[PDB]
Design a protein around this ligand. Structure first.
Ligand code: HEM
Length: 89
């Protein structure tokens, strides 16, 4: 169901590794923030754009293609989007 709690559970395990509290450890300022997305993200503040990054891996970010399920992928994207939009970073 591309759930946010699912998305969180994924995030917490998989993404937090580099992005702890939306907190990009590799490129300090390239955080999971709305603003940071809208500047740095190529594809803009769009679910498509988010998902695409997570799938395919981009710059210094690993690809999650087939490592996460489709729903899982969608959930983590949705969650990140919700966090950003809501400012729950
Ligand atoms: C876990 C599956 C995971 C998610 C979710 C995630 C999201 C994410 C987004 C949405 C961006 C864009 C942020 C912005 O535009 O400012 C992004 C960017 C980077 N990530 Fe990430 N990310 C997840 C996992 C990981 C892992 C495990 C690493 C660390 C090895 C990592 C690193 C990075 C880096 C670097 C970037 C910037 C690269 C770029 O977009 O050019 N991510 N991530």
């Amino acid at each position: 169901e591309a759930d946010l709690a699912l998305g969180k559970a994924v995030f917490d395990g998989n993404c937090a590794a580099c992005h702890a509290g939306g907190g990009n450890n590799v490129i300090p300022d390239h955080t999971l923030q709305k603003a940071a997305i809208e500047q740095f993200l190529d594809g803009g503040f769009n679910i498509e754009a988010i998902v695409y990054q997570i799938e395919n891996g981009k710059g210094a970010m690993p690809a999650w293609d087939g490592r996460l399920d489709e729903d899982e992928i969608a959930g983590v994207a949705a969650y990140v989007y919700d966090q950003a939009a809501g400012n729950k970073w």
